[PDB]
Every structure is written in C-alpha cells, then in structure tokens.
C-alpha cells in the first residue's frame, strides 16, 4: 500500500465527516481519524510527506487537540472546532 498523505487525508476527512454529520456516528468518525493522526505522529519519510506535514501538520495537530478536548469535556462545540480546522485542510488539499 502506497498512497500519498494528501490522498489519505482527503479521503479520510470526507469519510469521517460523513459518519459524523450524515450518520451521527461519532465512534465511526474517531475510528477513521485515529490512524490518520497516528501516521503523522510517526513522522514524514518522503519529501512529499515532509512538505504535506510542513503545510498541514500544525492544523491537523490542533484539530486533534480539539477532538481530545471533546473526549474529556463531552461538549460538541469542541468537536465542531476540530471540524473547522479539518475542513480548512480539506479545502486546501482540494
């Protein structure tokens, strides 16, 4: 499996937003987003991975802090804040 980080995030955000906004399935939205973040955590290993991490790494790390805020708070406004940063990434990738 060879896939650019640009692609895996565009598809992953699209799918996670469908589960969450369309299906009201928050468990399924996490299930999708956790492995994407865990790959950023491991670090870029190609030039194309590195430039994607340079442009979007900080926003995606901030979207993850909001999601983690929500885990502990139970307040859906913390998860919306994460979707504003995810959508800005998604639009930039698009």
């Amino acid at each position: 499996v060879a896939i650019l980080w640009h692609e895996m995030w565009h598809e992953g955000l699209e799918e996670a937003s469908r589960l969450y906004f369309g299906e009201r399935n928050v468990k399924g939205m996490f299930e999708v987003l956790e492995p994407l973040h865990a790959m950023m955590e491991r670090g870029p290993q190609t030039l194309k991975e590195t430039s994607f991490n340079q442009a979007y790494g900080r926003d995606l790390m901030e979207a993850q802090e909001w999601c983690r805020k929500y885990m502990k708070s139970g307040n859906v406004k913390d998860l919306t804040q994460a979707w504003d940063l995810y959508y800005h990434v998604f639009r930039r990738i698009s």
Binding site: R24, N75, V76, K77, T80, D84, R91
Partner: protein, 107 residues
C-alpha cells in the same frame, strides 16, 4: 420548507451556477434568536458548492435563489434542517433555524 426574505438587495441577475463555489457570510440562530454559529465571528467567509447535498436543504434551495451581493434571512423548517434528531449539543430536535446570509462572490 424555506422562507427567504431580503435584508439587502443583490444585483438581481448573478445567481449561483452549477459547480460554482458560493462565498458567504452567515449567522445561524435558533427561532428565538439564540445564536449558535457565525462565520462573521471568525471574520472568515464560508465557502461551499451548491447542488451536491453539501449543505442542509434550506441552504441548497435558499442560497440558489440569491444573487451576488444579496443578504437575506432564511427561515428553515426542521424538515429542511436537522429534523427530529437535530445536532445533539447544538441544534435541538425539530428546530426551525434562522440564518442571516450574505452571498459575497461566486468563484
């Protein structure tokens, strides 16, 4: 489903066309005026594409009818918004929404 009332007129002749992106500013309120969201609070316009069910059906039918520069009040019944379920923590069940939206530009 959606009632559209003009706040500030638009040109009357540039309407959104298939595959354009709409760039708007909006403020969303429940029926009694309680604000739940505003792009203007972020001072960052909201962009989306019509006709692809990206947004609730009130905006899809509402904003399609607007011309560039128009600002309008969209009053959207629950069936054209978030329905019996709402969006838990933000939009109650069976909620009529009122959005103030301004169509800034098409790109």
């Amino acid at each position: 489903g959606v009632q559209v009332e003009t706040i500030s007129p638009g040109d009357g002749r540039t309407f959104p066309k298939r595959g354009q992106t709409c760039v708007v500013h909006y403020t969303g309120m429940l029926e009694d005026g309680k604000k739940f969201d505003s792009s203007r609070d972020r001072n960052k316009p909201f962009k989306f594409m019509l006709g692809k069910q990206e947004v609730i059906r009130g905006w899809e039918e509402g904003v399609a009818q607007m011309s560039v520069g128009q600002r309008a009040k969209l009053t959207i019944s629950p069936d054209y918004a978030y329905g019996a379920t709402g969006h838990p923590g933000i939009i109650p069940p069976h909620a009529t929404l009122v959005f103030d939206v301004e169509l800034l530009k098409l790109e």
